[PDB]
């Protein structure tokens, strides 16, 4: 049945939603890509209120005090994926187009899923069929590169993809797409450093600028908004609800215009003073990034409170789906990154800094309000990200990468930039062996194959 089949792929999707949704405890892939960053504070009651996440923050994670959950969805996504791929050729009443269709969206969500335990474990069992006979070789992290951008490379060659829309129906916005495909690889490509596809990753990267279908929103706030969801600078969002804006709101908030009295919220994230004073006064990013609560305000504060917090994710009463879940869609991949994503490939290829380079970094000042750069080094786009992108997950991610970016400044790369502050929380500097956190206890319990990454 091609209904049995959908109802398989629809399952291959469920686990996106997964960590928000509260698998063992409640968790935010944001929150996981940002709190070994420079961005935010981790906050909560005390520093062992998830206490997993104080201590990653610091560079101190164990075995027992890490992201397992996430080790568990991707597993549970892969295992969704691969057996949708089993069942495809048992299809007998699927048309040849729907099955290409159902297999190219079950292998990107599977790359999709193997991308983000590279990204944290890197060293990882790596399968791409079911174990009923039953453990998987645990691959090095550039072995799960080799695999995962050669299997990647497979799905966007087939051109089977849509690039935007399913056929235009936008009862169907959340499916994989060609345009979220290249956005992976380009993800990918750039965390590896891997110079042999800059160029392949800027082709497709320019496919997305040369399109009719793609812009950057005109209003930088409107995109975090009910109605900016799935505007045209969206290459793809996971769709909900969310717990997400309980967890990164103040406690025993009195209420505003917005967010009623007698709400929760858990007081993570809290964001970074010197997150807030890095925008210019002219930056519109800067109001839309930052949620300032006047210091009359009386809440209760929690640990590491600042009276900032995270704007584009914040509660509001008119989101709600106690009342801890919400509706808004978590932006995955925005047409910025693309433009961001080119500027960099582009200077990392030869390019001019006066060429297509400047046109694409520039599209994104001006329409942040902020005038546009005359010549631009690979320097700039890393820092036109950090304003670009707080509370989407991508800043640590860039600080790590940028250890292998020649021209990247001290405030652009992990060694230098997650460094001890003068307030005693951070009091580890980065180093490359805490690129890939610990692998669980429990894993380890299961699999006595399994090797420990080098962390301590």
């Not at 009923?132 to 087939?158: C, G, K, N, R």
Request: aromatic share 14%; charged share 25%; net charge negative.
């Amino acid at each position: 049945t091609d209904e049995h089949i959908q109802e398989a792929l629809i399952a291959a999707y469920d686990p996106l939603h997964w960590p928000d949704w509260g698998l063992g405890q409640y968790n935010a892939l944001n929150i996981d890509g940002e709190i070994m960053g420079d961005n935010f504070w981790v906050g909560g009651a005390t520093k062992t209120d998830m206490q997993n996440w104080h201590m990653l923050f610091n560079y101190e994670a164990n075995e027992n005090n890490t992201l397992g959950s996430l080790w568990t969805v991707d597993y549970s996504g892969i295992k969704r994926c691969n057996d949708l791929l089993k069942y495809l050729d048992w299809g007998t009443d699927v048309t040849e187009a729907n099955r290409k269709l159902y297999e190219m969206q079950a292998r990107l969500l599977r790359v999709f899923y193997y991308n983000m335990l590279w990204h944290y474990f890197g060293n990882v069992p790596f399968y791409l069929e079911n174990l009923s006979e039953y453990t998987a070789p645990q691959y090095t992290a550039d072995q799960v590169y080799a695999e995962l951008i050669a299997e990647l490379e497979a799905v966007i060659d087939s051109k089977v993809l849509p690039l935007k829309y399913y056929k235009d129906d936008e009862g169907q916005l959340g499916r994989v797409t060609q345009a979220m495909a290249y956005m992976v690889y380009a993800e990918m490509v750039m965390y590896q450093n891997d110079e042999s596809r800059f160029s392949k990753a800027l082709g497709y990267m320019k496919e997305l600028i040369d399109s009719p279908s793609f812009r950057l929103n005109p209003s930088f706030a409107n995109i975090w908004e009910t109605e900016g969801e799935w505007c045209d600078e969206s290459i793809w969002e996971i769709n909900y609800g969310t717990v997400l804006p309980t967890l990164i709101s103040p406690n025993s908030f009195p209420g505003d215009d917005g967010w009623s009295k007698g709400n929760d919220g858990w007081g993570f994230m809290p964001m970074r003073l010197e997150t807030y004073q890095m925008f210019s006064e002219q930056d519109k990013r800067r109001d839309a990034t930052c949620w300032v609560i006047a210091e009359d305000v009386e809440y209760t504060k929690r640990y590491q409170d600042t009276h900032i917090w995270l704007q584009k994710y914040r509660p509001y009463d008119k989101n709600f789906k106690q009342n801890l879940n919400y509706n808004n869609n978590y932006r995955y991949y925005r047409y910025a990154e693309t433009l961001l994503n080119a500027a960099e490939l582009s200077l990392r290829t030869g390019g001019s800094g006066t060429g297509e380079a400047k046109t694409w970094l520039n599209e994104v000042r001006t329409r942040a309000g902020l005038a546009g750069l005359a010549n631009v080094t690979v320097d700039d786009v890393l820092t036109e990200r950090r304003l670009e992108f707080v509370g989407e997950g991508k800043r640590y991610f860039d600080l790590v990468r940028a250890e292998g970016i020649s021209g990247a400044s001290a405030s652009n790369k992990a060694t230098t930039a997650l460094v001890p502050d003068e307030y005693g929380y951070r009091t580890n500097s980065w180093t490359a062996k805490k690129k890939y956190i610990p692998i669980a206890q429990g894993e380890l319990d299961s699999d006595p194959a399994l090797v420990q990454n080098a962390y301590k």
